[PDB]
Scaffold this active site. Structure first.
Site, PDB file in Angstrom:
ATOM      1  N   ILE A   1       0.794  -1.234   0.000  1.00 58.26           N
ATOM      2  CA  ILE A   1       0.000   0.000   0.000  1.00 58.26           C
ATOM      3  C   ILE A   1       0.834   1.297   0.000  1.00 58.26           C
ATOM      4  CG2 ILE A   1      -1.467   1.487   1.429  1.00 58.26           C
ATOM      5  CD1 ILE A   1      -2.846  -1.035   2.435  1.00 58.26           C
TER       6      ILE A   1
ATOM      7  N   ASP B   1       4.508   1.400  -0.154  1.00 63.10           N
ATOM      8  CA  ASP B   1       5.748   1.272  -0.930  1.00 63.10           C
ATOM      9  C   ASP B   1       5.711   2.290  -2.019  1.00 63.10           C
ATOM     10  OD1 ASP B   1       8.035   0.509  -2.333  1.00 63.10           O
ATOM     11  OD2 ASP B   1       7.136  -1.154  -3.410  1.00 63.10           O
TER      12      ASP B   1
ATOM     13  N   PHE C   1       8.365  -0.394 -16.887  1.00 64.00           N
ATOM     14  CA  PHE C   1       6.941  -0.304 -17.260  1.00 64.00           C
ATOM     15  C   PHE C   1       6.431  -1.642 -17.833  1.00 64.00           C
ATOM     16  CE2 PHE C   1       4.350   0.528 -21.156  1.00 64.00           C
ATOM     17  CZ  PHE C   1       3.134   0.898 -20.579  1.00 64.00           C
TER      18      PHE C   1
ATOM     19  N   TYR D   1       6.297  -0.595 -29.073  1.00 61.75           N
ATOM     20  CA  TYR D   1       7.192   0.240 -28.256  1.00 61.75           C
ATOM     21  C   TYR D   1       8.054   1.149 -29.103  1.00 61.75           C
ATOM     22  CZ  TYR D   1       5.888  -3.229 -24.701  1.00 61.75           C
ATOM     23  OH  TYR D   1       5.233  -4.105 -23.865  1.00 61.75           O
ATOM     24  N   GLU D   2       8.637   0.582 -30.150  1.00 65.34           N
ATOM     25  CA  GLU D   2       9.422   1.347 -31.120  1.00 65.34           C
ATOM     26  C   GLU D   2       8.580   2.516 -31.548  1.00 65.34           C
ATOM     27  OE1 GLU D   2      10.307  -1.959 -33.808  1.00 65.34           O
ATOM     28  OE2 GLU D   2      12.415  -2.000 -33.253  1.00 65.34           O
TER      29      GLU D   2
END
Lengths: 169, 168, 168, 170, 169, 169, 169, 170, 169, 168, 170, 169
Positions: free
Chosen positions: G49, G51, G84, G133-134
Site C-alpha cells: 500500500i 511502498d 513499465f 514500443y518502437e
C-alpha cells in the site's frame, strides 16, 4: 447401527458440545465440573486447533443428527498410549449405539494412529459403562481409591485398558 | 480436453476439507483422515507465500470441482518436486487420470523449470502404479513398511520422471 | 423447583449491565452503580479462564432471566469462597431466595469441594441477615464502617457456613 | 537425616536439573526421554512460573549441596489430588535419604497444599522404589500393563497412593 | 570405542556445528549447501527447540572433545519413522568411530523412541558411507536417480533402511 | 526506636523479600504458602508497579540494615480502607520495633493516604500478634471461623480494626 | 480512444487483476508464473500500500469497463529510472488502445514523477509488442540472451528505453 | 593465488562491510549511494538472514585478512538466473585477485547454486572491469543509456553474462 | 423534572456526544476546541474504558431522549477532589433542568464516590452558569486571569467549589 | 453564509479520494494525483490524534460536500500554520472562495490562537494569488522552480497573513 | 548566582530524582505522595520522552553538582499556559538560589516556549514560597479551600501567576 | 581545508549531537528549541534509520576530531529538493571551514543525489550565515516575515536557494 460415523469436531458443532459440557449428570461420570462458558470452550477449542495430542470427534447418524462425542486425549507417540472418553447425548442414549462407537475409536486409535494402548477411567458407581467396556475387550488395571470428588464424596474408579494387537486381530 | 487446472483459493476450502476427512481417499495419500476446517484454514493462511508448493484445483468446463493436484517439497537447487493427486470419488472412473497428470508434469517442466518429479504410490494399488508407469514414471523404490495404513505396515513405490524424458 | 443455575454467557451481558447500573440493587453489593458494557464486556473477556470465580445466571422453566449468583475469591488451599446474590427487582418477593442460595451451597460443597462459604450483608438489611441465618449461616463479623453507601459509613455482617454443616 | 530441606526450584538450579534430565539411568524410570536442551528446560521453566498446578523442589543438605528434586504435579483443586515424584542425584543415592524426602513432600502436600491424595507411578523393575514407598505408607491401587516403552521393550508400572487421612495420623 | 556418547545439541556447541555446515567436503555428502550464517543456524535452532520431529545430537569422547553430529529428522509418529544422518569431524575421521556412532543412533530410535523404521539416503559415489550402513544391518530399498545436483553434476543416492525387529533381535 | 524508617520496596531489595516468603515460620503467620520463586516474586512486582491499590514498604534502621516489610493492600478508594500486614525479620524480632513499625504504618495511611479504615487479620494462635495490635488502638470485629488451613489444621483469625478519628485525635 | 483513463489500483479491482495473473498466456509475455492465489495477491497488495517504489494503475474506458493494467515498478529516485509493464485484457485486445495507454505511463512517469528514464523488457518472440514500443519512441539497449524460462525453453528479450526529454518535448 | 576463499558473511564482518559501503570510490561504480549507518547495515542484515534469494560472501586469504566481498543477488529459481558483483578492498586491489574471485563465484553459482545464467552490470568508464570480465568469459548483451546518475552526470553501463553451459566446459 | 436520570456513557451514545463536541458555541464555555473526529472521540473513549479517574454520564428523560452530559474528571482518591462539567443539549436548554442535573453529580460524587470536594471552572462571561452554581452551593475560590483563549481573546474564569458535608447534610 | 466547516470523518473518505486522484485539482496543490483509498484510509487512521493538523470538510445547508480546507504543519512554538484549499470542480465559480478562506483564518486566529498563516500558490494561477492578496495575504516568496508540475519546473508564491492584521 | 543553569532531565539523573520524590519533607508541599519506585520513576519517564506537554529540568551549578529540579507542565498550545514547580535539594536550600531558578524558568517559558501564562500552586503553610514568588512577580488569583490532604489534615493552597506581558518588560 | 570529510551520522556520535541540540546559542540559529533528552534524540534516530527523506552527516577533520553536522532534510523526490542545514561546533568556528562544508554539501546533493534544488532558511539577524551562503552561489528568494519566535521576539529569515545547473557548470 452401521450408519453411525465419526468426524473431526468443528466450530459449527460447538453449541451441541457446550450443551453436554453444562449437563451436571452427563458430566458427572466424566469427573469434570459442569461449568464451561461458550467463551471458554470456544477459546480452548481454538488454542488446541493444532495440538497433535488430541483427537476430538463428533458422532453422527445418517440424517445428520449429532449423536454424541468420542475423544482421544493424552496421545503419547513414545509409549504409544491414549485416554478415551465417550458421551452419547441425552436424546440418543439407551439405543444400543455404545459398542459401535467405542469400537471406531479403537479402530481409529489402532488402524490409524497406530497406537499401542488405549486406557479409560470409569466410576465403579456407573457400573453399566464398565460392562460395556469389558464387552469391548477392556480389562481392569487399577482400583483407584477415592480419586475424583463426584456429588458430595470421594468416588473410586477403574482404570481399564486394551492393547493394539488385541483389537486389530 | 475440458479439464482446467488452477491455484487453491478460499471458497475452495470446503471441497478440500471434505476429501481431507475421507478414509478411502486419504489412505492412498497415506495421510491421516483427520483435519478440521480450522486446521485446514489456518495452515492454508500460513503457507500462502510459501514458495515450496503449488496447490492446484481441478475444474471442468461446467466448472464443477473435479479434484486437486499438489507439487510439494519443491527444492530450487536440485529442482526436485513430489506429485500427489486426488480425484473426488464422484469423478472417478471417467478417464481423467492421464490428462491431469500430464498438466502437472507440464506445469513442473515447462513453467517451473524442474528436473525431477517424484511420487509415492501404495503397492496394493495395482491399477495405479501402471497409470504412472504408463505416463513415463519408473519405480526407483520399494519402500518396505514405509506407511502404516489400514491396520498394517505396507509398502509403496517411489517412482520418478525427468524433464529430459517428458519434454523429450 | 423450576429454578435452574448456569454459567454466564455473552447474550447474558445486557441482563448483567442493566442490574449493574442500578443503585437500589448494587448498594446491597456495596459496589458502585457505574459500569458501562465496554467495561463489562472487556472485564468479562479477561477472566474467561480465571479459575477463581463461578459466575452463574438464574433462569426459570419459561427460561426468563431470574437473577445471578457469584462464587468469587475461590482459594484452592483454604477452600474458602464468598457468595453474592441478586434477584432482579421484577422477580423479588416471589420466594426465590432460599432455593437459589442452596443451589449455590450445593455447587460449592458437592462440586467444588469447598470448606467455607462466606457472605457480607448490610446491617440495615434486617429481613435478609435472617434469610442466610435461616439457611445455616452465622455471623462471625460486625464490620464497623466497612462500606460507604448512601451517604454514610455503614456496617455489614460477615456470615459463614461450612461444608460440614450444609452436607451434615 | 534431619539436615535435608526442600525449597523452590530457582533459575540457578537448572544446570543441576538439565544434567539429571539428560541422564539415561535416572530418566528411564521416570518414563520420560533422556533428552532436553537447557533452552527447552529454561523456556519451559519460564512458561510455568505462575502455574498453581505444580510445586518443584530442589532438595539441599546443611551445606547447600544439591541432593535431589521433588515434583508434585497435576495439582487438581476439586478432587484435591496430585502426582508425586522424586530423583536423588547419582552422587547422593544409597545414603538413607529417600524417606525423609518422601516424608517432607507428603508433609508439604498434606499440611500445606492440603491435598486429599498423593499418588506415585512406580516400575516393577525397580523393586526398592516399590519398597521404600510401602515403608512410607503408600498403597498400590493399580498395575498398568505395558503402559510405557522404556529400555528396548514395553514394561508394566504400578500405581500407589496415600490419603491425607492416613498421613496426618501415624 | 566406548568413550563416545551422545548428548543433546547445545547453543554453546553451535559454533562447532557452524564449521561443519560451511565446509564443502562434508556438506556435499549431506545434499545441502555449504553456506549457513551463524545467525541462520542459531535462529533456526531457537525456531525448533520445542519441535518433536527431530533429535539433534552432539557426539563427545571421554576428554570432552567434540567428535561429530548425529541427527534424527522427520521423526514421523503415525508411521514410526525417522531419517538418520551423521557427520564425523574431518580431524576425527577414519579412526573407526563410525559404527559405534551409527550404533548409538539405532539404539536411541529403537530402544527409547520406539520407532519402527530408520532410513537414510547415501550418495552412490560416497560408497564408504554405503559400506558402513550395510554392516550395521541397513538394506538398500531405492536407487534415487539424479536426486541431488552436487559438484557440477546430478548424482544418484541409495535409500537404505533397517527395522526395529532386526535391531533388538 | 527512631531509626526505623519506611521506604518503597525496590528491585534490589527483592532478594530479602524472597527469603521471608520461602520461610514457613513467618508465612504461616501470613496465611500464605511458603513457596515463591525469585521469578514469580520479581514477575509479580513488575506486574504491579503502577498498581494504586497497594503500597509496599521495606523497613530500614539507621545503619541501612534491612528490618522487615510493611504492606498496605486492597487500598480500596470509595470506602477508604486497606489491610495492614507486616513481617519483622527473625534476626530482628523481639527487640521492641513492632509498635514503632505498626505506628509508622497507621501514620502513612491516615496522614498521607487519607484512609478511614485500617484492618488486619491475625491468627488466634498467634496471640503475640494480637497483643501488639491492641496497644496501637486496634479493636476486634470478627472471629473468622476455620478461615485458613495451616500446619495440618484449619485455624481461626481475628479481624481487628482502627479508624482515622481514633488515630489522630 | 481519447476516452481511456488511468487510475490507481484499488481493492475493488482485485478480481479483475487476479483473473489476468492466472492466465497462462497473458502472463506468458510478462515472464511471470501464472499462479497467484487471491490470498497471496490480496496480501501482496496490502504489504505494498505505502511502498513508494511502485505505481499500479487500472485502465478504464467511459462506460467503466476495466481495460487492463499499466505498472511502474523499480522506481529509483536517485538515478530516476523505472520499469513499465502493460497488459490489455483478453476482451479488450486488438482494438488499437496500446499506443494510447503506453503514452499515459510516459506522460505519468515524465509529467508527474519527473523520471529521467523508463525501460521495459520484451520477448523477441512477442515481436508485435517491440514494434508497438518502437512506434512510441523506445530504442533497444540489450539483447538479453536466454534470460527467462518461458514455455519449455530459455527465451531472449530486448531491453528497451526512452528518456525523459525525448518524451516530454 | 589459490589461498583465496569465499565464506558466508557473518555479523563480525559488518565493520568491514560498512567501511566499503561508505567509500565514494568503490560504491560510485556499484551505482549505489556511499551512505549507510552500521544500524542500516545490521538491521537490513537481520531482515535478510533467511532470504534464499542471495548469497553474500566475505573473501579472505590464508591468514584470514579480509580481502573483498561477493554478492550473488536476485536469485530467481524458475529462470535460474542471478546478478553477480564484487568489490576488492582498497588495500588488496591490483594484486591479480579479481579472476580467482570471479571464478570462485561462478563456480559457486554453477556447481552449487545450479544457476543457468550469471550476469553483471559494468560501467564504460571502468575499462579494466570490462576487461577482466571478458577474460573470465562474460559476454556483453547490452548497453544501457544513461541508466544511472554517478559522479555529477548520467552514465551508460553494459550488461555481460555467462551461462552454466559455457563455464562448466572450459 | 424528577424524571431526569443519569447513566454511564455508552458506545451507542457516541453520535449524540460527537454532535455536541463539534458545536463551536456549546464547546465555547467548556474552553475546548470544537474539533473531534468521530474516530478520535471513539478512540479516546476506548483508551479510557477502564481509567478509574473519570465518570462520564449521559443524561436522559423518561421518553429516552438524551438531554446532555455530566462529567467527573481528575478524580484523585488521595485528596478526594474532582472536576465537574455539564452540557445540556441545544434542544434541551432553557427548560430548568440545570439545578436538577448538577445536583445528581454531587449526589454521585458525594453519596457514591465519597469525594471530599468538587470544583468547576466557569467563564465570568457566561454569567448565567455562575449563578446556577452559586444557587447550588458553590462558592468562588479564584479569579483566574486570562487563563483560556476563547473567541479571539484571553478570558477570565471563576474556580468554584462545594465540599462534601456541605452537600450531604 | 450557508457554508459550514467541520472535521474530516470516515464516510467523508470517498469524497477526498476522488479529488485526490484528479490531475487538474491536485496540481494546484503540487501533489501527485495518485492515492488509493487504502493509502488514504490508513494514513488517515495514523494521524487521527496528530495534533499538528486540522482537516476540514466544507458543506452547504443542503449538506452537499462543497470542498475541503487543511491547516497542516501547525507548530505550537512559532504558532505558524499552512493553509490549503480545494473546491470540487462542481462547486467552482460560485463565489465560495472568500467565505471559506475567512472561516479558515477565523479558526486559526480565534480558536487555535495562531500567529501566522501561510500558503503556497502557483504563479500561473493569476486569478488566485489575487484572491488571497484580496483576503489580506501578501507574497513574501518567489520560489524559483519549487515544484515540478505538468512537464516543467515552475514557480510559486509564498504568501502570509497574521493574526495581527486579520483580527486588526 | 549566575553559575546556575537548567538542562534536560536525563536517564542518569533519576537516582537524584527518586531520592527527592521519596522525601516526605519536600513532596508533602508538592501535594504528591512521597512514594515511588525507581521502576515507576523510569518507566513513567520512558512513557513520556516525546511528550511536547512538559519540560523537565535538572538544575546544576558550575561544577555540575545537582542542585534542584524544575517542571513546566500541562503545556497547552491553544491557551499557551503551563504549571510551573520547583524543588531545591535539601543540601542546597537557603543559599539564595530560588529566584535565579524561578527566573530561568520564566525566561524559558516566555522567551523560548512562548507561553502566555505561567501559574504555580502554593501552600499557605509555606510563607517563604508565597514570598519568593511575589518577589519574582507572581500574582495570586485564587485561594483554594482544603483542596489537598497533606500532613494529617486538609489544607488550602493559593494560585499565583505571571503573564508573558509582565515578565518580558521589567 | 581538505581534511574535512562527511560521513553518515552514527550512534557512537549521538553524544556530540546531544551537546549541540541542548546549546541555546547554536539552536537559536536552527529555529528549534534547545531541549532534547539523549532518549528523544536516540529514539528519534532509530525511528528514521530507513527513512530516505534525510541524510545526516557528521563532519570529521584529519585527526578524527568531530567538527560539525551537515543535514539534508525533506529530500523530496518528485521535485528533487532538499533543505540544507549546518552547525560548526563552537570550539571549531571562525577557522574558515564553513565554505568547504557548505561546498561538500552542495557536492553530495547535486553529484550523487541528483537533486535540482538546494534551499535553506537563514535568520536575517544571523547575517554571517547570510554572507556564507551567497559566496557559495545561494540566491535569496523569500523574506519570511515573523517566521520564528526566538529569544523573546518573532524574527525574519531569508529563504535562499541554489540550482543544480549553477553548481556543476
Amino acid at each position: 447401527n452401521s450408519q453411525l460415523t465419526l468426524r473431526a469436531l468443528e466450530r459449527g458443532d460447538l453449541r451441541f458440545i457446550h450443551n453436554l459440557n453444562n449437563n451436571r449428570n452427563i458430566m458427572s461420570y466424566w469427573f469434570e465440573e459442569p461449568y464451561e462458558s461458550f467463551d471458554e470452550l470456544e477459546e480452548l477449542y481454538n488454542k488446541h486447533i493444532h495440538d497433535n495430542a488430541e483427537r476430538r470427534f463428533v458422532v453422527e447418524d445418517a440424517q445428520k443428527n449429532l449423536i454424541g462425542l468420542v475423544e482421544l486425549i493424552e496421545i503419547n507417540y513414545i509409549h504409544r498410549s491414549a485416554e478415551f472418553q465417550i458421551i452419547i447425548a441425552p436424546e440418543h442414549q439407551g439405543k444400543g449405539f455404545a459398542r459401535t462407537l467405542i469400537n471406531r475409536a479403537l479402530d481409529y486409535s489402532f488402524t490409524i494412529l497406530n497406537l499401542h494402548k488405549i486406557y479409560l477411567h470409569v466410576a465403579v458407581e456407573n457400573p453399566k459403562a464398565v460392562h460395556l467396556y469389558e464387552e469391548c475387550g477392556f480389562v481392569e488395571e487399577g482400583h483407584l481409591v477415592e480419586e475424583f470428588f463426584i456429588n458430595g464424596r470421594y468416588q473410586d474408579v477403574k482404570r481399564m485398558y486394551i492393547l493394539q494387537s488385541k483389537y486389530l486381530n
